Design a protein around this ligand. Structure first.
Ligand SMILES: [Mg+2]
Ligand SMILES: [Mg+2]
Ligand SMILES: [Mg+2]
Ligand SMILES: [Mg+2]
Ligand SMILES: [Mg+2]
Ligand SMILES: [Mg+2]
Ligand SMILES: [Mg+2]
Ligand SMILES: [Mg+2]
Ligand SMILES: [Mg+2]
Ligand SMILES: [Mg+2]
Ligand SMILES: [Mg+2]
Ligand SMILES: [Mg+2]
Ligand SMILES: [Mg+2]
Ligand SMILES: [Mg+2]
Ligand SMILES: [Mg+2]
Ligand SMILES: [Mg+2]
Ligand SMILES: [Mg+2]
Ligand SMILES: [Mg+2]
Ligand SMILES: [Mg+2]
Ligand SMILES: [Mg+2]
Ligand SMILES: [Mg+2]
Ligand SMILES: [Mg+2]
Ligand SMILES: [Mg+2]
Ligand SMILES: [Mg+2]
Ligand SMILES: [Mg+2]
Ligand SMILES: [Mg+2]
Ligand SMILES: [Mg+2]
Ligand SMILES: [Mg+2]
Ligand SMILES: [Mg+2]
Ligand SMILES: [Mg+2]
Ligand SMILES: [Mg+2]
Ligand SMILES: [Mg+2]
Ligand SMILES: [Mg+2]
Ligand SMILES: [Mg+2]
Ligand SMILES: [Mg+2]
Ligand SMILES: [Mg+2]
Ligand SMILES: [Mg+2]
Ligand SMILES: [Mg+2]
Ligand SMILES: [Mg+2]
Ligand SMILES: [Mg+2]
Ligand SMILES: [Mg+2]
Ligand SMILES: [Mg+2]
Ligand SMILES: [Mg+2]
Lengths: 55, 196, 288, 140, 95, 105, 97, 118
RNA sequence: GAUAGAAAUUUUUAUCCUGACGCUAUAGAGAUAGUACCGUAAGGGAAAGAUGAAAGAAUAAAAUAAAAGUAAAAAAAAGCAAAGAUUACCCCUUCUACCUUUUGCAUAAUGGUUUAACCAGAAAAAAUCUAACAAAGAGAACUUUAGCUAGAUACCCCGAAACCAG
RNA sequence: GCCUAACGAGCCUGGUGAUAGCUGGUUGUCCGAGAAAGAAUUUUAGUUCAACCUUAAAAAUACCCCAAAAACCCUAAAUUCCA
RNA sequence: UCGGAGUACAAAAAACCCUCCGAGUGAUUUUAAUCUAGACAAACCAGUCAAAAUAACCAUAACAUCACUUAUUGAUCCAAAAU
């Protein structure tokens, strides 16, 4: 359920996750579905990070 | 959703007879050995001229399936969205027509550049103004349909959508209802707390 | 919002003529025609398998099959008759209360949990009801009157500390089915049946104040209850002096399915009326 | 829904056009024709690789005729032309032999000279002599 | 196995499985050892122990048993007092 | 196959490229549909490219006919008298451009 | 392989005839209609096939259960045989087991 | 059984005339090999096939360069009948970064740094 | 063992809108017909049609002349019949038919005179792929420690000697 | 032996699309990888497991491998194991 | 069917209507427990070892022994026993 520039979100998500893994996380952007998809289980840390930004 | 609307209704009555249902040939047409030719059982075998069909269509067949609710809803939303974004949606008030002459309607669609075909949606079936019904009963391309008869296929078949104002107020509510709703406990036709 | 919409002004009408299924949605089927998929057509060569006759599933080719050399042992033995209690953690209960699905204000029994879709019962699978488990014990801050079919010491302890009341009640399979989906039952056109008693194995469970059993002697309740405090080291509140107390004390008859209705009545939902038997025999049967 | 092949006609023509010039029933009957056409294509590609060998052998035979005329065998001619740093493929050499008999007699003269120079140097048994045509030039 | 029944057209279960095996919800199957009640006087106490075990089946057997068994048997079960409820989830499995 | 088909020696028409070079392609005729999807590429080509092509080759006359057809064709025609038919049916703008070039040269 | 020498009469299908223009009209009857009738109700067909689907065995088996006692002798017999055949084939034959 | 094969070290003790013969310096071993695969791996045991693959020698009559360290010499020793080994020579020395584009390898086994000036 | 297999208990809203992503003369009924013909009998069981508004327009008028088979037009050293070619048809050079079956077939192992028309892969448990909604999902019944729902992906043809009933 | 031109047990119809681990057959084009047998089995004309292999997917080490190391009478080509 | 030696020379494995010996148990008292890390072996089924911890016993007391010791054995179901 991502409404907007999803590429922005991809940038911010990989910039957020990068300090964790030492490397950029692998990603898939579905622009038509309005969806982002990330390799590995980041579920908790990402709910936290999306809470911090007030969505 | 368009594919769904097309198929889910469909029942093919196409039947072919298997070598079992063909008329005769319960008996071996000649002896297994010595006659010098190919060996056969029934003369109704699928190899033979008049014989049964090897696979072929079988029985009345139903193609029936249901796209999940929220998907069909989403389909309707999207059709509306797209009719609008491409400028081909026109919210009309009323539907009162000055006269029952259909030529009036055709030339009206010519003056506003509405395209060849038009879908006129009204709120209920009985409440349709009689001038419209007269005018639109004798036309092929202009089609009058009540709100509950709005659908993806018909919306993609007609170049232009014309929605009555109470019709908009209806659809908006009907479709929006689903984003906020629980999964059904039992069928929605039964008593629910808030729901009709 | 959706910038996609702005690209749609520029492009031709969406019609029935141009419509593409999402790429990957349909993996195209393949038919045994041509050089690749023809000539033995994936069936191999001669033998039993090219002819389609290979033996049944477990069959090992004549050596005593693996699934039959292993000895029988009761594993699933009598499985159909075991009781099944759908677990509900305090974590889920709290999460439901927080979001306003079940309200703690009125009493919470099975029907309330089902209507919030916090829980799902299927009696046909021999679900005998909800059991309460302690997963969210520490985090649990809510004040509730709850009725479940089973509970753990720790769960109860965690509800008491917050000034609520737990009670374990029993429902037989028919009772249970009626309880969980009441409106489908009220269209059935039958009276409201008696609640059956528990079977002999489950009597020592519901007769104890330990479990806060619905058949338990209330004389032991305030005793056993206080015991639970000594163990977990918290001050037991006086439920009597609370404003919501009249709701917290609310029970059911051991013979009653619902709150405020009674065995033998009939709910006419079209007239929004209740119907009760005036007959003596009926009233003796339903009230026994 | 019955579906039959309507266009079978053309399906057949795309085989049969390649078969027109065959002898016998192979040039009509689709069964026989098909097999024959396939054999014809296979034979064709194999021959496409063969043709190059055939032509090169032709060229060598011709160059040998041409050389033998001048009293010079083929191998001598060719390698002693290499030892002069003259690289002309056999195609071109054969064409010279036919259409440029003069230039070819020159080439043959050169080769013969280079050979004699080689024998002279091998028999001489010293590093000092470098035959005029036995000198090896580097690119500039 | 009957893949399509005669009356219902559904797929039948092979009951001979359901008597000797146990399906945890993770997909692991659990079975008794073979010959564990047989000729005990003749065996070592060590061997006897090895026999009294409940053991797990390899992947192949598991898939075979799953095919031989309908959907109903793979459902999530909550039994009261159940010994095996402890074992039905899998933990710390990195694969 | 080579025994199968006809053959010819390598030649030029009218000793082209000896005295001077003469582009041999004479005229080019397109037929397409304003409406039909099959002709889509061919329409785009007519929009953007044809014009420029016509400047790049002054000596070839280019006739464009919109007509109701299902299969857009381009008919190349040469000084030689030779007429070569082609189908631009269901191709890109890019593909058509390359094709028209082959025809030109 | 002889192909027909005369152009067929060109068949003109107008897509604006009544049946084609009104197609798929009430399909959303459930959603827009405050669910009362499911779209199944719209389906015109054989009694055993309305709003239901299945492979040929299931189909036949179902036909027999519903209308099997209204059937003509020959047809009932044929149906039984078809069922027996399909049973044997699906259950005991195939590649995949 | 046909098996792998030991190759006694005595084979690899060079005689003093060999230096004169093949043009190696008695004092200093060369630094690099140019190895070429001269024969085919077909009809040879799988292990030689593997050794050839991991030496980069897959394609025939193509040169490849390798360190003259013992790690490498071991594998080379296994396949020595399938290959030609000649010492790399640097008349103009090793290439700088300006000379990378102009480098070429002559058949006498020598690497020329400046190729085709003007 | 192969396999077989309930029930209690549940659910089901009228009537009109009937037709066809069924066949088109080897198809669809066996069917122009249970006729001809074949059997003592029970029984078996065919094939076949095509002008036009008018033939009360047959010195008759009109659009395919395209299968195999022949004719127009017999053959000319030499060789799986072609291919490379070539000024040139041959002459030269190079190639051990095709399927099937096999460790291995030019095989002197199998099958086919040829042409036309017919004549043979079918299923959704688990999986994967796409999408919806998501701690829940499904238009009731179920399943859920990221799941649930939907869609798409799959498993042939001909043949015995027999056996049983009438 | 004979019982309507085939009687070690008639014929016809139905059961019947009997069943064949046995033979035969199995229809467009082009591309990517690609297989010779350990175990049981009224089994060796077949199956079902391994080992290989194919399609996806997650990973981290994989071959190659110098010393050192693996038996008691004699004993080869050589294995095993590893930086 | 099971085991030992050769075939099969040095890790393992390895066939034959191949070469040779055996087993389908005795005798004895030291009557040889419970539970569990990790392994061997292995298509599956079966087979093998085994630390720590308990309990038994000297009061910190767990390998039954011999006969080449290796082999002296048999799945499910089903029957008898009642623990
Ligand atoms: Mg029959
Ligand atoms: Mg019969
Ligand atoms: Mg014959
Ligand atoms: Mg038969
Ligand atoms: Mg027929
Ligand atoms: Mg194939
Ligand atoms: Mg074929
Ligand atoms: Mg075959
Ligand atoms: Mg075989
Ligand atoms: Mg449940
Ligand atoms: Mg080449
Ligand atoms: Mg059995
Ligand atoms: Mg007919
Ligand atoms: Mg007929
Ligand atoms: Mg002809
Ligand atoms: Mg010849
Ligand atoms: Mg043979
Ligand atoms: Mg083979
Ligand atoms: Mg041969
Ligand atoms: Mg022979
Ligand atoms: Mg012959
Ligand atoms: Mg032979
Ligand atoms: Mg023969
Ligand atoms: Mg032959
Ligand atoms: Mg034979
Ligand atoms: Mg054959
Ligand atoms: Mg023959
Ligand atoms: Mg599935
Ligand atoms: Mg298929
Ligand atoms: Mg497949
Ligand atoms: Mg019998
Ligand atoms: Mg029998
Ligand atoms: Mg007779
Ligand atoms: Mg058969
Ligand atoms: Mg067999
Ligand atoms: Mg044969
Ligand atoms: Mg191979
Ligand atoms: Mg046996
Ligand atoms: Mg396998
Ligand atoms: Mg070593
Ligand atoms: Mg290593
Ligand atoms: Mg191991
Ligand atoms: Mg110990």
């Amino acid at each position: 359920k991502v409404e907007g520039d999803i590429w922005a979100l991809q940038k911010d998500v990989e910039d957020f996750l990068s300090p964790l893994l030492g490397k950029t996380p692998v990603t898939q952007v579905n622009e038509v579905t309005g969806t982002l998809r990330v390799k590995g289980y980041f579920d908790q840390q990402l709910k936290a990070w999306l809470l911090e930004k007030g969505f | 959703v368009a594919i769904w609307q097309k198929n889910f209704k469909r029942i093919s009555y196409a039947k072919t007879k298997t070598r079992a249902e063909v008329r005769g040939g319960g008996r071996k047409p000649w002896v297994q050995k010595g006659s010098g030719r190919a060996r056969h059982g029934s003369i109704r075998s699928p190899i033979w001229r008049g014989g049964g069909v090897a696979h072929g269509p079988r029985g009345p067949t139903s193609y029936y399936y249901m796209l999940p609710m929220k998907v069909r809803v989403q389909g309707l939303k999207v059709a509306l969205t797209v009719k609008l974004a491409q400028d081909d949606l026109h919210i009309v008030d009323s539907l009162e027509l000055p006269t029952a002459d259909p030529q009036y309607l055709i030339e009206l669609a010519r003056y506003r550049r509405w395209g060849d075909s038009v879908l006129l949606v009204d709120l209920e079936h009985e409440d349709m103004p009689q001038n419209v019904v007269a005018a639109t009963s004798g036309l092929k391309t202009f089609n009058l349909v009540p709100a509950v008869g709005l659908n993806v296929h018909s919306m993609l078949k007609h170049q232009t959508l014309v929605l009555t104002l109470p019709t908009v107020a209806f659809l908006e509510e009907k479709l929006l209802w689903h984003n906020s709703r629980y999964t059904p406990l039992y069928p929605f036709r039964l008593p629910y707390c808030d729901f009709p | 919002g959706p910038r996609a919409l702005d690209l749609l002004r520029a492009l031709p009408r969406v019609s029935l003529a141009n419509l593409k299924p999402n790429p990957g949605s349909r993996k195209p089927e393949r038919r045994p025609r041509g050089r690749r998929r023809g000539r033995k057509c994936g069936r191999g060569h001669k033998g039993e398998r090219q002819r389609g006759t290979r033996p049944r599933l477990g069959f090992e080719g004549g050596q005593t099959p693996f699934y039959l050399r292993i000895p029988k042992y009761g594993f699933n033995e009598g499985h159909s008759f075991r009781h099944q209690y759908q677990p509900l953690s305090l974590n889920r209960l709290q999460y439901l209360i927080d979001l306003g699905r079940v309200d703690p204000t009125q009493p919470i029994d099975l029907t309330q949990l089902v209507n919030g879709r916090g829980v799902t019962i299927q009696p046909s699978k021999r679900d005998y009801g909800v059991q309460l488990v302690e997963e969210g014990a520490d985090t649990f801050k809510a004040k509730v009157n709850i009725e479940v079919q089973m509970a753990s010491e720790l769960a109860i302890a965690a509800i008491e500390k917050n000034g609520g009341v737990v009670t374990t009640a029993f429902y037989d399979p028919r009772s249970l089915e009626i309880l969980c989906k009441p409106v489908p039952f009220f269209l059935r056109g039958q009276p409201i049946p008696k609640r059956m008693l528990p079977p002999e194995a489950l009597v020592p469970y519901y007769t104890d104040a330990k479990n806060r059993g619905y058949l338990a002697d209330p004389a032991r309740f305030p005793e056993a209850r206080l015991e639970l405090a000594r163990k977990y080291g918290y001050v037991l509140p006086d439920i009597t002096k609370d404003e919501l107390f009249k709701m917290l004390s609310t029970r059911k008859d051991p013979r009653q399915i619902f709150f405020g209705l009674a065995p033998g009545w009939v709910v006419n939902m079209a007239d929004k009326k209740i119907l009760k038997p005036t007959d003596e025999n009926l009233l003796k049967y339903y009230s026994s | 829904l019955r579906s039959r092949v309507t266009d079978r006609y053309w399906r057949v023509q795309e085989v049969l056009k390649h078969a027109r010039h065959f002898r016998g029933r192979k040039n009509r009957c689709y069964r026989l024709a098909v097999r024959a056409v396939t054999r014809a294509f296979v034979k064709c590609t194999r021959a496409r690789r063969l043709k190059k060998r055939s032509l090169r052998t032709l060229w060598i035979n011709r160059i040998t005729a041409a050389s033998q005329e001048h009293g010079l065998k083929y191998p001598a001619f060719i390698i002693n032309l290499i030892k002069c740093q003259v690289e002309l493929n056999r195609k071109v050499l054969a064409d010279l032999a036919i259409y440029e008999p003069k230039t070819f007699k020159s080439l043959a003269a050169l080769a013969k000279r280079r050979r004699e120079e080689g024998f002279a140097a091998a028999l001489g048994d010293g590093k000092e002599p470098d035959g005029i045509f036995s000198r090896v030039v580097q690119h500039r | 196995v009957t893949y399509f029944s005669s009356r219902k057209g559904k797929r039948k279960t092979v009951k001979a499985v359901i008597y000797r095996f146990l399906r945890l919800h993770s997909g692991l199957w659990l079975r008794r050892k073979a010959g564990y009640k047989k000729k005990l006087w003749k065996k070592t106490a060590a061997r006897k122990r090895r026999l009294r075990e409940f053991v797990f089946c390899n992947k192949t057997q598991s898939k075979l048993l799953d095919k031989m068994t309908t959907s109903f048997w793979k459902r999530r079960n909550w039994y009261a007092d159940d010994p095996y409820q402890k074992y039905q989830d899998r933990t710390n499995l990195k694969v | 196959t080579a025994r199968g088909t006809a053959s010819r020696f390598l030649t030029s028409v009218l000793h082209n490229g000896l005295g001077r070079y003469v582009q041999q392609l004479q005229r080019l005729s397109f037929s397409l549909s304003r409406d039909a999807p099959s002709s889509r590429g061919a329409r785009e080509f007519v929009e953007r490219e044809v014009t420029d092509f016509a400047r790049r080759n002054p000596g070839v006359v280019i006739y464009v006919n919109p007509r109701p057809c299902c299969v857009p064709r381009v008919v190349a025609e040469y000084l030689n008298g030779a007429v070569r038919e082609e189908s631009i049916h269901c191709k890109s703008v890019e593909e058509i451009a390359a094709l028209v070039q082959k025809l030109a040269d | 392989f002889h192909v027909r020498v005369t152009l067929p009469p060109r068949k003109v299908v107008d897509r604006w005839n009544e049946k084609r223009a009104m197609f798929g009209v009430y399909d959303n009857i459930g959603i827009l209609g405050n669910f009362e009738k499911h779209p199944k109700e719209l389906i015109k067909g054989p009694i055993w096939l309305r709003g239901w689907k299945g492979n040929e065995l299931q189909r036949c088996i179902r036909k027999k259960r519903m209308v099997g006692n209204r059937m003509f002798i020959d047809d009932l017999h044929n149906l039984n045989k078809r069922i027996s055949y399909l049973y044997k084939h699906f259950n005991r034959h195939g590649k995949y087991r | 059984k046909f098996t792998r094969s030991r190759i006694p070290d005595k084979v690899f003790q060079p005689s003093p005339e060999d230096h004169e013969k093949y043009g190696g310096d008695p004092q200093y071993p060369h630094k690099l090999h140019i190895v070429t695969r001269i024969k085919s791996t077909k009809r040879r045991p799988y292990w030689e096939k593997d050794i050839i693959k991991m030496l980069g020698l897959e394609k025939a009559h193509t040169p490849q360069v390798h360190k003259n360290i013992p790690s490498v010499n071991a594998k080379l020793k296994v396949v020595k009948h399938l290959i030609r080994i000649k010492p790399l020579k640097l008349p103009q020395g090793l290439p700088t970064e300006e000379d990378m584009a102009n480098t070429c390898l002559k058949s006498n086994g020598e690497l020329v740094v400046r190729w085709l000036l003007n």
